[PDB]
Design a protein around this ligand. Structure first.
Ligand SMILES: Nc1ncnc2c1ncn2[C@@H]1O[C@H](COP(=O)(O)OP(=O)(O)OP(=O)(O)O)[C@@H](O)[C@H]1O
Ligand SMILES: Nc1ncnc2c1ncn2[C@@H]1O[C@H](COP(=O)(O)OP(=O)(O)O)[C@@H](O)[C@H]1O
Ligand SMILES: Nc1ncnc2c1ncn2[C@@H]1O[C@H](COP(=O)(O)OP(=O)(O)O)[C@@H](O)[C@H]1O
Ligand SMILES: [Zn+2]
Lengths: 434, 36, 146, 434, 48, 443
């Protein structure tokens, strides 16, 4: 019934990078099809990422448009999973209007390294049932309730000032870190959500907490290394972690963070989990940006880079110079290149079934045959776009499983680039400019 | 100050709002309330 | 002599645009939802910071354990505007000297049994030789920052 | 009444129950093969399952590409966001190009939140506050329909105090939200002094207590922007808000992840629901190659809205490639990511129906022999030019004392206001005098 | 400055022209409201 | 354990005592005349005599010019600043191109200044104002000193302090069992918090308890602190002692970089000369290393003419893989190494050369035994044959993915079949370029 915010996108079916334990890729599994050579290579770099033993590695996933280069990357991101960083950007996301192309890449690198930390804590957490004090220094008590208990604290001189300056009331839910003494209201308890009948401009109702009242535990955090850089850039720098106001962090800070995080790693206080930076459509970078990657791939704490690109031997942006992939040779021999191969009819039928499995659609085998031909006479990604429209015409037609007649209908409604280009030329001078 | 409950060596964290005994954990809170 | 002193007639806003025309007012009911559906609510910070499912799991606000910030201080600093910024800054200037002393004379073992971080240990901006606490503590370096 | 805009007659696609186009309906005429395709796109958007899927309306100037995209918005109605943008809006001075695309992608997804608006209003009969000296406030309200006592929390009373409210003021309280407005003093006290610096207002003739069920429409971009920069919280009354100018800024994907995770929490609690909408990009050929290369991530993204592009350029150079010709002014690598709905020139027999639909919308009465002539001059020029003459012709007809267009009015206007192809003769004759 | 025809608009601009709150005014004028509370009695100290 | 970079094996230049270069030492192989040249540059830097002498490590991609420039950083060691850069760092949006060069010219020079820190700290056990037995005439009582008792885990002692301290001891909300400190060079007292001894006196209190200090109540050390002249330039350009309206406003606002004036550089040069002459501060001139120098604009190159001539400047190292390219920021003008002829006149070029196959095999072996990877002799011979067919940065780089493949296929060392399998999975630039040309209509 209810539609989540995350739903059926152009890669939603891939739920891994289908490999047996020997890194042998299956013909079709985890929502991926074909690409057997490139999927071995992707599996080998996926194990290189999981080891984390080495720094400044890079891979380029090259090949024709509509041959799975973003699919291998967005699949590998899920075979890696959460718990290890995977920053994905399109190459034109680095052309910021408030920081250089080398800062926007430095922030993209530093956001792909995870410092894990252990932290020891105790937090009290519950509905405050009442607060009581003597009246002269002050001494008092307050009662906390949680679903399992009602309990009372003897509290000090500054705590009474802190509660009365923070204006807590009976039936508020609060948390305090005892080691720090800092108070925090969460809201009003749901069983209390009626004792006032117009509500102050911010208040929120929460279910009352449960289990033990004073939880004492260590927790693990992952902090991406970029946050440690931002938090040190100015006295309240952490707001820029959300506002994006991270205007060109001073290099003296970043080298201090590398020194401190290397010191923690030797003392064992933290562990550096290397992530991936995926620069989709990397050909969009400038020569001034590729020449920065030439050193960024040599830090003792760079991520593993992955890139993808559609370009032939082509002009590097910001120059007249032509090179493979639109990438300079002095970066291309730092890169290790994986080549994706165009699909056979067999692979094309397999993938169009896996899109229908994902979109929750039934098709006739006659319709898969006609669709596979269309997706092989014209780009794969056009046939992948016919099947949703074929489902919607089939619903309007009061059908259930889409037939060849529904495919030919959508194929007459929605054109590909070839039929569009041809009918554009049949009226050419009515369009503007060529 | 230590937990009221006889078997527990842990420091006092709080007291029971019902019974008034000094306590250290949910475990000692159950144990106290199931003998007071 | 003194500048020529000028006072233009005050800019006239009609009773109507004042009552009905201000989006901060006519849209206030909708603006409450922008404040409620916010990850800066202390409730959501706790639910992310301390009630995760995985042992390793990717939480924002993890840095609030290593800066000295309460989830309600993060919320207040995001939702009370520049006054909360300024007062929290003034309190951070006070705290910088307190941190500098411990940071520059404490050196046994580690923060606990040779493992774990501690609160404030992302505030590294004090460690610079030329940070205002260390500079104030060192009367030769004070004279180079004139 | 509403002003007659350039698209104000198109009220839907005008499809039948089978999704075939009616020859003239809902203020459209002709153009059937694109209208039937937009029928499939309306069913796509209403189905909610899809993310980032996209459409290109391709065809000459004056052929309905903006009209059909607005017809899609009319078939959806107000409840589903339709965000219009020109590609030329992307070139900001305050943020990068590849941010303005992401802001507009986030404007086209709505939360749809229900709450019961609850208004109390009237003369305040008393304010009485009930630790010792604070608890909560009883307030009495009165109108010419009766009286109530409310039980305001102290965080509401802080606003009554800030509004400088006293017994005998007329107040509006919004009980959901703590919006408290003083509305002047109740005019039963309009003789407390003979002349005093308060506006006096009559005791409200309405009910003391109004409930409405209301629906709040709020885009994900509203949630991002209202959280990413520290909120005002400074309702005038606080001169700190004067110094720091509220510039736009590059909101980070580090925040948007949390906004997605919070929206998931609230739609899983059922407090809100989601209406994935449309982003409409007029003049798509006006985007830079950097922006097109960012859409190669944005259209793939499993959260993105449905996207409609519109273009009228031929085989022109792609903006900002300085060299590369491509159809519709769009890179082939993006042109392969969109379903193309081609759009067609009108025959004279369609244009007459358009001029009539315009006339009866624009407030004109027209004689059939003037309408024949606006048909004929449309064949010599463009649909847009003929439509543009109607108000001018009517306005001369009104001055000449006829309540309908007749041949001599349109024939006069035709000689008074030149079309583009007529001026392009004059500029070739008088060439060396410009 | 903006004029308006409304009793509440007058209060909002009067309060702004007085300096919007004792906290915000002292914060700019004396550096923090704690420094204003100190300034009043640093009057009497030897080494303020 | 620590993760391994593209250069972690480079431990130094590995020179003889005579300054000649060994065939393979300190993790480097070959380049002997360029290692000998960098030997002379290490003496040049270690002498501290010179300013603005500059070298250009010319040579094709993957010939070790970045490795030699980092080997110099090892031969100098961490005590003197080595400031790495790429030519592309100058393209800031906050500050002009030429000023980013000037900042790096000021990061490559370090003060090394020594000072005593002396402090009194401990848990305060008493405040005891000591009255004199007689007041002065007309006064009810008079205090000659305040006794303060302090303690630490080593012991307790009283201090005797000037009576003006007592106001600071109520500015700070000091009360017995707090832990406090007093800077012996300044006499100001600061409060850290309640001592950890009292953390159990309540179930809650609104203050973080501070662990009881250790070592004596009075502490001393001399500490040697290193600041680059760019740190002095910044700390004078944007003050941090924020107890004024301009400083708080300037610290709440965005921390924008600014075009520091030639005057501040002047005044700081005028003051550090005082402290070097007074024997307070040592100076350690160092190196500014720019890799990818061909990325600088002709505006930036025409600024380096002043910067490399200025009698303050560091030693400078440049590197460039480029041939006869156009100078960036002009349409026509070609110049060797991408560097203008009039700048290229001002630099001692060091030629770096292609490796012969038998050197590549020796480099790949050094990478293997530092990446942590064991390889068979026939596999290494094949991997050097791949190096011969391609480039060093391809052939070196197959080692780890060959180790993953070997590990997965149940073997603890690389063997022949792994190297030929990885070479089938991953292309290099020269093989991929052929695949593009054979398909150029489809991309
Ligand atoms: N089929 C139609 N039915 C009704 N009106 C139409 C139709 N086709 C075009 N028009 C009218 O054409 C006029 C111009 O809008 P139109 O959509 O044609 O602009 P367009 O040329 O396609 O868009 P653009 O200028 O962005 O390329 C509008 O008044 C519109 O209503
Ligand atoms: N091997 C594959 N297995 C499953 N889906 C794939 C595969 N290759 C491509 N796709 C799908 O086909 C479409 C095009 O692939 P994509 O990687 O996006 O092309 P490109 O490399 O040119 O950007 C997408 O819908 C993608 O999810
Ligand atoms: N003389 C050397 N001895 C050993 N390893 C070297 C040597 N020169 C270069 N390397 C290896 O070859 C790689 C490529 O050379 P490098 O200096 O990094 O690139 P470039 O020549 O383009 O500046 C080095 O990163 C290192 O792994
Ligand atoms: Zn006990």
């Amino acid at each position: 019934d209810v539609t989540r915010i995350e739903r059926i996108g152009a890669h939603s079916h891939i739920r891994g990078l289908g490999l047996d334990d020997a890194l042998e890729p299956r013909q079709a599994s985890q929502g991926m099809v074909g690409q057997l050579a490139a999927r071995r290579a992707a599996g080998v770099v996926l194990e290189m990422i999981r080891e984390g033993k080495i720094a400044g590695r890079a891979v380029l996933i090259a090949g024709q448009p509509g041959t799975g280069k973003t699919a291998i990357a967005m699949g590998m991101a899920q075979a890696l999973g959460p718990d290890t960083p995977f920053t994905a950007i399109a190459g034109s996301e680095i052309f910021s209007l408030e920081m250089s192309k080398t800062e926007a890449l430095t922030q993209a690198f530093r956001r792909s390294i995870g410092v894990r930390i252990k932290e020891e804590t105790e937090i009290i957490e519950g509905e405050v049932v009442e607060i009581q004090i003597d009246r002269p220094s002050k001494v008092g008590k307050l009662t906390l309730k949680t679903t399992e208990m009602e309990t009372i604290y003897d509290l000090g001189t500054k705590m009474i000032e802190s509660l009365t300056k923070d204006k807590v009331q009976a039936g508020d839910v609060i948390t305090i870190d005892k080691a720090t003494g800092k108070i925090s209201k969460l809201g009003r308890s749901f069983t209390r959500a009626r004792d006032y009948d117009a509500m102050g401009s911010q208040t929120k109702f929460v279910q009352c907490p449960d289990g033990e009242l004073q939880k004492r535990k260590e927790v693990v955090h992952t902090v991406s290394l970029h946050e440690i850089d931002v938090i040190n850039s100015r006295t309240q720098g952490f707001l820029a972690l959300f506002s994006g106001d991270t205007g060109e962090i001073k290099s003296e800070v970043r080298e201090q963070i590398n020194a401190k995080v290397a010191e923690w790693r030797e003392e064992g206080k933290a562990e550096i989990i290397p992530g991936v930076l995926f620069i989709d459509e990397v050909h969009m970078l400038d020569i001034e940006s590729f020449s920065f990657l030439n050193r960024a791939l040599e830090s003792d704490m760079a991520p593993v880079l992955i890139m993808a690109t559609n370009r032939g031997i082509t002009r590097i942006r910001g120059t007249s110079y032509q090179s493979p992939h639109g990438i300079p040779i002095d970066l291309l021999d730092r890169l290790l290149i994986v080549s994706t191969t165009p699909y056979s009819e067999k692979d094309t039928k397999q993938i169009l079934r896996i899109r229908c499995e994902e979109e929750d659609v039934e098709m006739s085998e006659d319709a898969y045959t006609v669709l596979t031909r269309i997706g092989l006479e014209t780009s794969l990604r056009y046939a992948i776009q016919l099947i949703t429209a074929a489902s919607l015409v089939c619903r309007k037609r009061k059908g259930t499983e889409v037939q060849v007649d529904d495919i030919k209908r959508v194929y007459s409604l929605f054109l590909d680039e070839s039929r569009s280009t041809q009918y554009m030329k049949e009226y050419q001078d009515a369009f503007l400019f060529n | 100050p230590r937990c009221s409950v006889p078997g527990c060596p842990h420091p006092r964290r709080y007291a029971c709002s019902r019974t008034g005994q000094a306590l250290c954990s949910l475990q000692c809170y159950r144990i106290n309330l199931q003998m007071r | 002599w003194s500048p020529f002193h000028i006072s233009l007639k005050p800019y006239h806003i009609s009773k109507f645009i004042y009552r009905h025309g201000q989006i901060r007012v006519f849209n206030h009911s909708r603006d409450r939802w922008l404040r409620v559906l916010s990850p800066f609510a202390p409730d959501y910070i706790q639910r992310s910071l301390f009630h995760r499912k995985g042992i390793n799991e990717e939480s924002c606000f993890s840095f609030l354990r290593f800066i000295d910030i309460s989830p309600a201080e993060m919320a207040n600093l995001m939702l009370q505007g520049l006054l909360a910024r300024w007062l929290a800054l003034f309190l951070s200037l006070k705290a910088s000297y307190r941190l500098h002393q411990l940071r520059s004379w404490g050196a046994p073992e580690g923060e606990s049994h040779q493992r774990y971080l501690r609160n404030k240990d992302f505030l590294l901006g004090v460690n610079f030789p030329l940070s205002f606490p260390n500079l104030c503590s060192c009367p030769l370096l004070k004279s180079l920052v004139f | 009444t509403q002003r007659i805009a350039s698209h104000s007659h198109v009220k839907g696609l005008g499809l039948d129950e089978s999704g075939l186009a009616k020859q003239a309906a809902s203020g459209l005429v002709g153009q059937e093969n694109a209208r039937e395709a937009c029928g499939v796109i309306v069913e796509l958007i209403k189905s909610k399952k899809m993310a980032g899927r996209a459409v290109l309306l391709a065809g000459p100037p004056g052929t309905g590409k903006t009209a059909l995209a607005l017809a899609i918005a009319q078939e959806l109605g107000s409840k589903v966001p339709f965000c219009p943008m020109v590609g030329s809006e992307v070139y900001s001075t305050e943020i990068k190009k590849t941010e303005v695309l992401m802001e507009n992608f986030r404007r086209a997804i709505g939360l749809r939140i229900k709450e019961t608006k609850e208004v109390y209003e009237g003369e305040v009969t008393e304010l009485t506050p009930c630790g010792k000296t604070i608890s909560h406030v009883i307030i009495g309200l009165k109108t010419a329909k009766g009286t109530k006592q409310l039980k305001l929390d102290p965080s509401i009373f802080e606003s009554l105090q800030k509004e400088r409210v006293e017994a005998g003021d007329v107040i509006y309280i919004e009980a959901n939200s703590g919006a408290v407005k003083r509305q002047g003093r109740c005019d039963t006290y309009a003789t407390e002094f003979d002349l005093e610096a308060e506006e006096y207002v009559p005791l409200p003739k309405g009910d003391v207590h109004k409930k409405k069920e209301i629906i709040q429409d709020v885009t994900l971009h509203d949630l991002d922007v209202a959280n990413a920069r520290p909120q005002g919280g400074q309702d005038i009354l606080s001169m700190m808000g004067q110094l720091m100018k509220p510039k736009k800024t590059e909101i980070t994907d580090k925040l948007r992840g949390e906004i997605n995770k919070v929206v998931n929490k609230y739609i899983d609690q059922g407090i809100a629901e989601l209406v994935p909408g449309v982003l409409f990009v007029d003049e798509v050929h006006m985007l830079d190659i950097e922006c097109f290369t960012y859409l190669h991530r944005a259209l793939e993204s499993s959260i993105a809205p449905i996207v409609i592009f519109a273009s009228n350029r031929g085989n022109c150079v792609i903006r900002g490639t300085e060299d590369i010709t491509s159809p519709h002014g769009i890179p082939l690598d993006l042109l392969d990511r969109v379903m193309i709905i081609r759009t067609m020139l009108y025959t004279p027999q369609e244009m007459k129906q358009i001029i009539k639909i315009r006339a009866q919308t624009e407030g004109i009465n027209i004689s059939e022999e003037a309408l024949n002539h606006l048909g004929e001059i449309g064949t010599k020029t463009t649909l847009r030019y003929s439509v543009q003459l109607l108000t001018p012709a009517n306005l001369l007809a009104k001055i000449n004392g006829k309540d309908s267009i007749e041949k001599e009015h349109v024939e006069e206007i035709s000689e008074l206001f030149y079309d583009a192809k007529s001026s392009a003769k004059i500029l070739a004759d008088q060439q060396d005098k410009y | 400055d903006s004029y308006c025809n409304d009793r509440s608009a007058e209060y909002e601009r009067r309060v702004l022209k007085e300096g919007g709150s004792l906290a915000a005014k002292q914060c700019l004028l004396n550096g923090a409201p704690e420094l204003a509370a100190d300034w009043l009695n640093r009057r009497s100290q030897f080494f303020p």
